[PDB]
Amino acid sequence: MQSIKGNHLVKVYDYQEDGSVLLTCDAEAKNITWFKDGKMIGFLTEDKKKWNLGSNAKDPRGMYQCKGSQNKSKPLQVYYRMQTPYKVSISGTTVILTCPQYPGSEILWQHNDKNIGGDEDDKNIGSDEDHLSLKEFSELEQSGYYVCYPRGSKPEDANFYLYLRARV
Amino acid sequence: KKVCQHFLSLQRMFNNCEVVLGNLEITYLSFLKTIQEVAGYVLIALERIPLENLQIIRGNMYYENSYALAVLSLKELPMRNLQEILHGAVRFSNNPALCNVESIQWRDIVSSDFLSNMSMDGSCWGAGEENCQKLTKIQCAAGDCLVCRKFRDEATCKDTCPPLMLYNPTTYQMDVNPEGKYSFGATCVKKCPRNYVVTDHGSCVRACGADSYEMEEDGVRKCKKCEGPCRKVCNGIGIGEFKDSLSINATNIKHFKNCTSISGDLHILPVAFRGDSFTHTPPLDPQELDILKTVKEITGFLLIQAWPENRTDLHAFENLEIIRGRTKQHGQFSLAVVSLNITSLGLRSLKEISDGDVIISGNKNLCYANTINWKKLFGTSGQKTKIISNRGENSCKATGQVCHALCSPEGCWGPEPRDCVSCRNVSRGRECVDKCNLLEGEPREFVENSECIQCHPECLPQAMNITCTGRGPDNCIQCAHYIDGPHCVKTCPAGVMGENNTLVWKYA
Amino acid sequence: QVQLVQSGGGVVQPGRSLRLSCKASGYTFTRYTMHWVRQAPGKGLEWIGYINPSRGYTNYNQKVKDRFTISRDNSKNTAFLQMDSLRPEDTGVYFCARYYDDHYSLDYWGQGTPVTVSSAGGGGSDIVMTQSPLSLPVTPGEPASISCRSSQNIVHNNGITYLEWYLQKPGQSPQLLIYKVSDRFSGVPDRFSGSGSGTDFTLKISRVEAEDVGVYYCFQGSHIPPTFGQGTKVEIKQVQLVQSGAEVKKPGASVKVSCKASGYTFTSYWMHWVRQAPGQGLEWMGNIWPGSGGTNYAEKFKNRVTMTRDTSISTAYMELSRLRSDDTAVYYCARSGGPYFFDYWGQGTLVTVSSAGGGGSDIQMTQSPSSLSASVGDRVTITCSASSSVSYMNWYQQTPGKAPKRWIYDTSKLASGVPSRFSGSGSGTDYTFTISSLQPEDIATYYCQQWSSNPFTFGQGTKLQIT
C-alpha cells in the first residue's frame, strides 16, 4: 500500500483540498509518461509530475501505470464510487471485493498494509474464498489501497494493488 | 475367632483364623498357629509347619474319599493337638521327611474309620520330646468339653443347637423358639452373625445362591428356596455384552439359560433362525429356543419376528409376565409377534405390557388372538393395539377354533382351555375348569377368589359337604389322619423340642 | 522457545490408516500456519500441506489431499494429520513446521516422526488368502484344481470353516459356488467340488465346460474383515437386489450407489456390500443390517464410506465420500446369507473416477550440485533453479538426523544464529547460496525452497562434505 517496492510506483495523492483525484509517479524524474488501461494518456516533460484524474465525483476508474526512463511500472487499479482487475460490487452499505487471481490457494487480504478478513471476531468483515465482504462500509475508514496474495507469496509481489474510494 | 474357607493370599487370609469352618488347605511360613477347631478337611501339602493348636478335623469334605489328613512328600510339623479327626479317615501317606510321627500311632487320632485308615512314608507325638500323644480314650474329643462332638455354643458340648423354631402346644402350633439359636459353625448364635445369611438347615452360610434365593424377611438376610427359577438378571440383546448382538443368535442363546429378567430386549429375528454368516453364527437349533422359557420379564422390546414353524405356538415364551417396554422397538410396539406362523398367540402369561402399544400382525394362522381385550393388559393409556391381518375372524369362528367356552368374555390367547384370559367359572391354576371340585373330585378343592386351591392333602375328603373351607390343614373340615389339638396334622408330635428341648408327649 | 513436537509415527500395514499429532509450544498456536512436510528415505523434503489454526483453512498436496487429513486442536495447540490408506511410498520422516508469514519461510521445524509402510501387521489384521494357480487355463473335460492358502488358519471359534469359493463368470455378479469347505450351492452343479483343512484348501473341478469359465475367487470367513482372494482366473487352454447405475465422477467428489431390494424381507438379510477394484480382488466395504440402520464399515474405508438405509422404499444406499483415484470399482451390493457369506448378489454400479488432477504439477526447483566435497576454508557455491519465477527463495540446513532449520529467508536474509560466512542471492528463477569459508560444523544437506505458490517446492538438496 504505502510502499513502492514491487514496481508499484503509481500512487494516489490524498492531500487534496478539492475533490480531485491526483496520481503520483515514483520514478527518477526526467519525463513521466502516463498510461490508462494500456494506452498512453499523458507525457510529462519535466515540470509537473502528478497526473490529475479529475474530480472524484466523476468516479475515475481504470488501470493507471507510469513510466520514466525504466520500463512501465505495475498498474494501480483506481475505483471511485461517490490483466484481470479486482472486481468491485456495492450492495446497500456492503462492499465486496473479488480476487482476480484465485488459483484456489489460501487467499489473504491486506488493507493499507494491514491484514483484514482473517479474524472471525469481525461480523462486518467476512472473507469467502476469492471474495472479501465489507459490511457497513465506512467511506473515510475503509477506503484506501487493498491487496490480495497467496500463502507463501508476498503482497508486494502482486500484479497490482486496488485503490478503493466509495461513498455508501 | 477369625474364619476362612496364592501363598500370600492364603497366609494372609488364614493367619488370624481362630477356627476354620471349611478345610485347612495348607499346600506347598509358620503362618498358622491357633487354628482351634476345624469342621472339615486339612490338605497338608508342605518341613517345619507348627499348626500347633490344630485340634479337630471333621472331614466335612475329603480330598478323594474320607481323605481328611492328606499328607505328601516335615519332621517339625508338631500336630500335637490333632487328637481326634471326626467323621473322616487319615490319609497320612507319603511321609518321607516326617520324623517322630512313625513312632506315634496315627489311629487314636481317628474313630471308627480305620477301614480307610491308610498311612505310608508311651510314644511322643511330634518333634521334640516335649510333646506327647496324651491319650484320653484308651462329648470331648480334644482331650464343658474343649472341642465338642457337634456343637459347642460357648462352652457346653451339644450335638444340635437350640432350634430357630420351637413348637408351642400352648398355641397348639409349632412355633418359633424365643431362645432360637442358629448354629454358627458349631457355635450357636442368637443372631446369625458375620454378615452370614440364615440357611435352610439353620446353619448360616455366606452364600446359598444354589437351588435357593436370598431374602430378608427380618433384619438378617435369609437364604430361601428358589420359587421356580429365582431372579437372575441377564443382559439381553442390546444392553451389555451382546450390545451389538442382532438377534437371540446361536452363539448367544445359551448365556440366556435360566436368565430370568432379560434386561435388554429379546429380538428373535429372521437372521437368527436362518443363522447369520457375516456375523459368524450357527443356525439356532429349534430345540434350543426352549432355553428362554424361564423368561419372566423382557424389560425392553420383544419383537419375535419368526419362530420355528413346526411348532404351533409361541410356547418358548410361555412365561413372559411383564413386557415393560422401557425401550420400544419403533417407539410404539412393545410385544410385536409379527409375520410368524403361530396358531395361537400362545403367550399364556403376559399380564402387564407396561409401556408400548402391541402389534400382533401377519400371524396368518393366529386366530384366537383377536378375541383378547387388550385393554386390561396394556400399562399406560397411550397404548393402542394393532392386531391386523390375523386369520379371518369369520373363518376362525366357522372352523371352530374358538376360545373354550370354559373361559370368560375377555378372550383367550389359545385354543386350549389353559390359555384363557379369564374364567367362565373358577380356575384350577393355569387351566380353568367347569367347576372346582366343590364336592365331587379327587383333589376336592376349595374355591378361592375364583380360583381352585387344592385342599391340604392332609385332610380326608367328605362327601356330603364341601371338602375344606380354606387353605392349610387348620381350615379343613375333615381330618382322617390324626388332628393335632384344634388343627389336623400328619402325625402327633413326640420328638419335639420344649423348654429344654423336651420331647412333647402331647397326647396319644 | 518455540517447540513443535511430532507424535504418532511408527510401522503400520500398507493401506492402514495413521493419525499424527504435533504439539506446538512457545507461541500462540493460532497465530501461525502449521504445515506438514515429509522426508522420504533418500528423498528430499516434500511439502504435504498446511492448516490455518485460526481459520481452519487447510490445503493439501494433490498427492495426498485425498489420503491425508490435516486437523488441529486449538485448545491443545496441537495439529493432527490423518494419513489413511497408507502406502509404501509414504514411508519416511514426517516433520511439522511453523509458518512465520512475516518471513514467508518455515522458521521452526519439529524433530519429525518416522513412518514406515510395510507388512509389519500385514496378514495379521487381514487373512491373506492367496490362491495357488493363477490364470490357470483349463481345457474342457479336465480335472483342473485351483487351491488357495490362508495366511492364518481360517477356522472360526464356532468351528465352522467358512471358506467359500465365489465364482464370477465374465461380466456377471459374483455367485457363490461352495457354501462351506465341501458343500455345494443349490443349483451349483456337482461338477465342482472342494476339500481342505487348516491353512490350505482347494477345489477340484473334475469336469469343466464353458460354464465354469471365469475366475474362482476364494472368500475368507472367520477373519474378522471378510477378505477375498487375488483371483485365479480359469480360462481355456426369485430375489433380486437391484443396483443403481453407472456413474463417473472427479476426485474428491461423492457417489451414492444404491441397491433396491426385492424378493426378500429387506430388513431380514444384511446387505453386505463388496467392492471390486478392477485389476484386483474383491474386498468387503461395509455391511448394513437393513433392519436397524447398523453399519459395520471396514477398516480400509473406515472414514470415507457411509452406508445408510431406507427400509420403506426397499432401497439401500452406500454414500462413498471423497473418492480417490483408485476407488474406481464396481460396487456389487450382495446379500449376506445364512450359511454362506455373500449369497445372491446385485448388478453392481461401476464408478470409474479420474479427474484431471489440478495441482499435480507445480514450481520445480533444481539444486546443483547434488553433492559437493570441499576443504575447510574453501568457498562453496550452490545454485538453485526454479521452473518459474519466484519472489523469494529460502535456504534450509539439514544435519544428518536433525530437523531442517531455516538458514536464509527472503533469498538474502540470514536466520537468527546463522554465521555471516553463509549468504544467499538470486531473483526470479536463479538463486545462489554461498558459504565464504567452509567449517567442519557445516556438513549437512542444504535445500532451497519456494513458497510463492502451493505446494511449497524444495530443491533436491545439496550434500556438503569435508574432504
PDB file of C-alpha atoms in Angstrom, chain B residues 217-296:
ATOM      1  CA  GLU B 217     -37.783 -61.379  55.992  1.00  0.00           C
ATOM      2  CA  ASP B 218     -36.233 -59.800  59.090  1.00  0.00           C
ATOM      3  CA  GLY B 219     -33.165 -57.751  59.904  1.00  0.00           C
ATOM      4  CA  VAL B 220     -30.999 -60.685  58.808  1.00  0.00           C
ATOM      5  CA  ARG B 221     -30.784 -61.825  55.207  1.00  0.00           C
ATOM      6  CA  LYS B 222     -32.161 -65.344  54.804  1.00  0.00           C
ATOM      7  CA  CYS B 223     -31.495 -67.915  52.087  1.00  0.00           C
ATOM      8  CA  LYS B 224     -34.855 -69.062  50.707  1.00  0.00           C
ATOM      9  CA  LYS B 225     -35.570 -71.768  48.176  1.00  0.00           C
ATOM     10  CA  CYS B 226     -35.844 -70.626  44.575  1.00  0.00           C
ATOM     11  CA  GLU B 227     -39.516 -70.345  43.577  1.00  0.00           C
ATOM     12  CA  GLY B 228     -39.427 -71.834  40.109  1.00  0.00           C
ATOM     13  CA  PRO B 229     -36.267 -70.197  38.906  1.00  0.00           C
ATOM     14  CA  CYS B 230     -35.040 -67.431  41.181  1.00  0.00           C
ATOM     15  CA  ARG B 231     -34.273 -63.983  39.826  1.00  0.00           C
ATOM     16  CA  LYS B 232     -31.131 -63.877  37.716  1.00  0.00           C
ATOM     17  CA  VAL B 233     -30.803 -60.696  35.678  1.00  0.00           C
ATOM     18  CA  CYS B 234     -29.282 -61.189  32.274  1.00  0.00           C
ATOM     19  CA  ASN B 235     -28.368 -58.560  29.756  1.00  0.00           C
ATOM     20  CA  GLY B 236     -30.474 -59.025  26.669  1.00  0.00           C
ATOM     21  CA  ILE B 237     -29.918 -58.280  23.047  1.00  0.00           C
ATOM     22  CA  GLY B 238     -28.866 -54.641  23.069  1.00  0.00           C
ATOM     23  CA  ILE B 239     -27.556 -53.678  26.528  1.00  0.00           C
ATOM     24  CA  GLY B 240     -24.489 -55.424  27.923  1.00  0.00           C
ATOM     25  CA  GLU B 241     -22.047 -57.886  26.398  1.00  0.00           C
ATOM     26  CA  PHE B 242     -24.385 -58.531  23.482  1.00  0.00           C
ATOM     27  CA  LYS B 243     -24.804 -54.795  22.972  1.00  0.00           C
ATOM     28  CA  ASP B 244     -24.103 -55.352  19.301  1.00  0.00           C
ATOM     29  CA  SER B 245     -25.999 -58.608  19.057  1.00  0.00           C
ATOM     30  CA  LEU B 246     -28.682 -58.506  16.379  1.00  0.00           C
ATOM     31  CA  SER B 247     -30.859 -61.493  17.499  1.00  0.00           C
ATOM     32  CA  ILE B 248     -31.102 -64.229  20.087  1.00  0.00           C
ATOM     33  CA  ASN B 249     -28.319 -65.763  17.999  1.00  0.00           C
ATOM     34  CA  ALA B 250     -26.970 -69.285  18.400  1.00  0.00           C
ATOM     35  CA  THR B 251     -23.676 -68.266  19.970  1.00  0.00           C
ATOM     36  CA  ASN B 252     -25.727 -66.070  22.313  1.00  0.00           C
ATOM     37  CA  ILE B 253     -28.737 -68.179  23.178  1.00  0.00           C
ATOM     38  CA  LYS B 254     -27.153 -70.275  25.909  1.00  0.00           C
ATOM     39  CA  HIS B 255     -25.817 -67.452  28.066  1.00  0.00           C
ATOM     40  CA  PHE B 256     -29.512 -66.693  28.439  1.00  0.00           C
ATOM     41  CA  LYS B 257     -30.088 -70.076  30.067  1.00  0.00           C
ATOM     42  CA  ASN B 258     -32.022 -69.533  33.299  1.00  0.00           C
ATOM     43  CA  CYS B 259     -31.878 -65.807  32.500  1.00  0.00           C
ATOM     44  CA  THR B 260     -34.903 -64.549  34.381  1.00  0.00           C
ATOM     45  CA  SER B 261     -35.375 -60.824  33.730  1.00  0.00           C
ATOM     46  CA  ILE B 262     -33.858 -60.191  30.300  1.00  0.00           C
ATOM     47  CA  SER B 263     -32.923 -56.584  30.871  1.00  0.00           C
ATOM     48  CA  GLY B 264     -32.348 -55.688  27.240  1.00  0.00           C
ATOM     49  CA  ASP B 265     -34.791 -56.798  24.597  1.00  0.00           C
ATOM     50  CA  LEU B 266     -35.201 -60.302  23.232  1.00  0.00           C
ATOM     51  CA  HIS B 267     -35.467 -59.770  19.499  1.00  0.00           C
ATOM     52  CA  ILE B 268     -35.612 -63.132  17.687  1.00  0.00           C
ATOM     53  CA  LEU B 269     -35.370 -62.177  14.014  1.00  0.00           C
ATOM     54  CA  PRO B 270     -35.194 -63.990  10.687  1.00  0.00           C
ATOM     55  CA  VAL B 271     -31.420 -63.907  10.543  1.00  0.00           C
ATOM     56  CA  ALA B 272     -31.198 -65.840  13.788  1.00  0.00           C
ATOM     57  CA  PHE B 273     -33.187 -68.899  12.774  1.00  0.00           C
ATOM     58  CA  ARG B 274     -31.656 -68.600   9.324  1.00  0.00           C
ATOM     59  CA  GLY B 275     -28.306 -68.326  11.103  1.00  0.00           C
ATOM     60  CA  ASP B 276     -26.046 -65.452  10.115  1.00  0.00           C
ATOM     61  CA  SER B 277     -22.849 -65.548   8.114  1.00  0.00           C
ATOM     62  CA  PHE B 278     -21.172 -62.133   8.178  1.00  0.00           C
ATOM     63  CA  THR B 279     -21.668 -62.257  11.944  1.00  0.00           C
ATOM     64  CA  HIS B 280     -20.484 -65.876  12.266  1.00  0.00           C
ATOM     65  CA  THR B 281     -23.452 -67.564  13.921  1.00  0.00           C
ATOM     66  CA  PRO B 282     -24.527 -71.206  13.605  1.00  0.00           C
ATOM     67  CA  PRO B 283     -28.194 -71.868  12.908  1.00  0.00           C
ATOM     68  CA  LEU B 284     -30.301 -71.662  16.033  1.00  0.00           C
ATOM     69  CA  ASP B 285     -31.478 -75.202  16.572  1.00  0.00           C
ATOM     70  CA  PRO B 286     -35.238 -75.067  17.144  1.00  0.00           C
ATOM     71  CA  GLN B 287     -34.950 -77.058  20.328  1.00  0.00           C
ATOM     72  CA  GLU B 288     -32.540 -74.547  21.844  1.00  0.00           C
ATOM     73  CA  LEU B 289     -35.245 -71.892  21.782  1.00  0.00           C
ATOM     74  CA  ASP B 290     -36.591 -73.663  24.809  1.00  0.00           C
ATOM     75  CA  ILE B 291     -33.793 -72.179  26.894  1.00  0.00           C
ATOM     76  CA  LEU B 292     -35.512 -68.810  27.254  1.00  0.00           C
ATOM     77  CA  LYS B 293     -38.693 -70.386  28.616  1.00  0.00           C
ATOM     78  CA  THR B 294     -37.701 -69.153  32.070  1.00  0.00           C
ATOM     79  CA  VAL B 295     -38.027 -65.546  30.855  1.00  0.00           C
ATOM     80  CA  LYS B 296     -40.412 -63.713  33.135  1.00  0.00           C
TER      81      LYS B 296
END
